[PDB]
């Protein structure tokens, strides 16, 4: 049941070993996070390994990597690190990541925009949760991404046409178009941001 | 707040009087509870969103602040949730060490 | 191995402080080793309240080596201090 299972104890033992190994060599932690691991492990690694706060040192270096997967993983890792550690330098790296996403909005093509912004959009909810000063930057970025992604929805004919559904209520929490999926992801992320900030 | 600032700079200028100054802040917190309550985020350096560094224990200015705060929190249970985690740990430490000053 | 010679150091405060600084390490093994240091030094620092608080806090930790070291430190400090023993 994700808490009273053998998998939880195995995860704790592995997290303890990784904590010891990262203390013994932080360069191993830097190399592993440059290689990357599945993002399902990210909350487990951030919560269970206390020496994960040193990842904020090379997240500015990791987010500058040419490969898109490295930048996606850097943003997703900083997402959990800002929740775990709300540092002033964590805020600086969060501002850097917001600027990187704003720049990659205007650098990447439409397929690359989908493949980059679908995983990294839930990171903005955690960025807003850790740093309430980031509300203006996150909301301006979300307006920009949504207005960019509505335009190529209008470019091609669509099977569901989300422009008409601009007046929709709060919905409950497969072969759809990538642009419409990205529009729904933007709407979902602003829904979670507003729900988090209201609570 | 002015009384606390003057007591703290007296503590800096004369560290021998730390027990008497702690008694002063115990009596000030215990008898002026509602007035200390809005002053708590100004005394404990509690950022609204940043995770604050744990203050150095056994630093006589910081115990002096905590003795004032905890004695104010004894008679007012309205806002004891303004404490962070390390302030609760320091509350346990002062209850173990300075139990004649800090109350339950 | 040098328990009889550590009663003649007389710069107790800064020595114990620089050992005690790594009770705050996130490593449970380092915390366990420091608890064993404090229990080993309990002959020359009785009634040292931050050591008592560290033993009390580490007795409730979730790491087995840290809890065992806290038990060892508590056994040493209870022999050398009655104010530690009563709580």
């Amino acid at each position: 049941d994700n808490l009273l299972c053998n998998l939880r104890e195995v995860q704790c033992l592995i997290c303890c070993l990784l904590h010891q190994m990262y203390i013994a060599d932080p360069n191993i932690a830097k190399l592993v996070h440059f290689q990357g691991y599945p993002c399902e492990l990210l909350p487990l690694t951030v919560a269970g390994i206390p020496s994960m706060h040193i990842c904020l040192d090379f997240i500015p270096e990791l987010i500058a990597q040419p490969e898109l997967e490295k930048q996606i993983f850097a943003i997703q890792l900083l997402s959990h690190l800002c929740i775990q550690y709300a540092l002033p330098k964590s805020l600086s790296v969060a501002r850097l990541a917001v600027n990187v996403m704003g720049t990659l909005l205007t650098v990447l093509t439409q397929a690359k925009r989908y493949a980059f912004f679908m995983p990294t959009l839930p990171s903005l909810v955690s960025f807003c949760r850790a740093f309430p000063p980031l509300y203006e930057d996150i909301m301006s970025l979300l307006i920009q991404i949504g207005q960019v992604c509505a335009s190529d929805v209008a470019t091609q004919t669509r099977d569901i046409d989300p422009i008409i559904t601009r007046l929709q209520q709060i919905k409950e929490k497969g072969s759809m178009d990538p642009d419409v999926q990205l529009c729904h992801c933007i709407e979902r992320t602003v829904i979670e941001i507003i729900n988090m900030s209201v609570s | 707040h002015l009384a606390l600032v003057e007591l703290l700079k007296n503590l800096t200028k004369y560290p021998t009087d730390r027990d008497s100054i702690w008694k002063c802040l115990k009596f000030l917190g215990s008898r002026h509870p509602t007035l200390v309550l809005p002053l708590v985020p100004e005394l404990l350096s509690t950022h609204p969103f940043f995770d604050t560094a744990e203050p150095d224990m056994d630093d006589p200015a910081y115990i002096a602040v905590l003795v004032l705060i905890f004695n104010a929190a004894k008679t007012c249970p309205t806002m004891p949730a303004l404490f962070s985690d390390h302030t609760f740990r320091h509350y346990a430490y002062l209850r173990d060490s300075l139990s004649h000053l800090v109350p339950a | 191995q040098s328990e009889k010679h550590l009663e003649k150091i007389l710069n107790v405060d800064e020595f114990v402080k620089r050992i005690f600084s790594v009770i705050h390490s996130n490593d449970p093994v380092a915390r366990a080793i420091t608890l064993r240091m404090l229990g080993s030094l309990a002959s020359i620092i009785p009634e040292r309240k931050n050591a008592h608080h560290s033993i009390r806090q580490s007795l409730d930790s979730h790491d087995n080596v840290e809890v065992e070291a806290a038990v060892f430190a508590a056994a040493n400090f209870s022999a050398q201090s009655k104010d530690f023993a009563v709580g």
Partner: peptide, 13 residues
């Protein structure tokens, strides 16, 4: 340092 929390108390020599 990887062995200490960022919110851990600092060591002043």
């Amino acid at each position: 340092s990887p062995s200490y929390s960022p919110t851990s108390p600092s060591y002043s020599p």
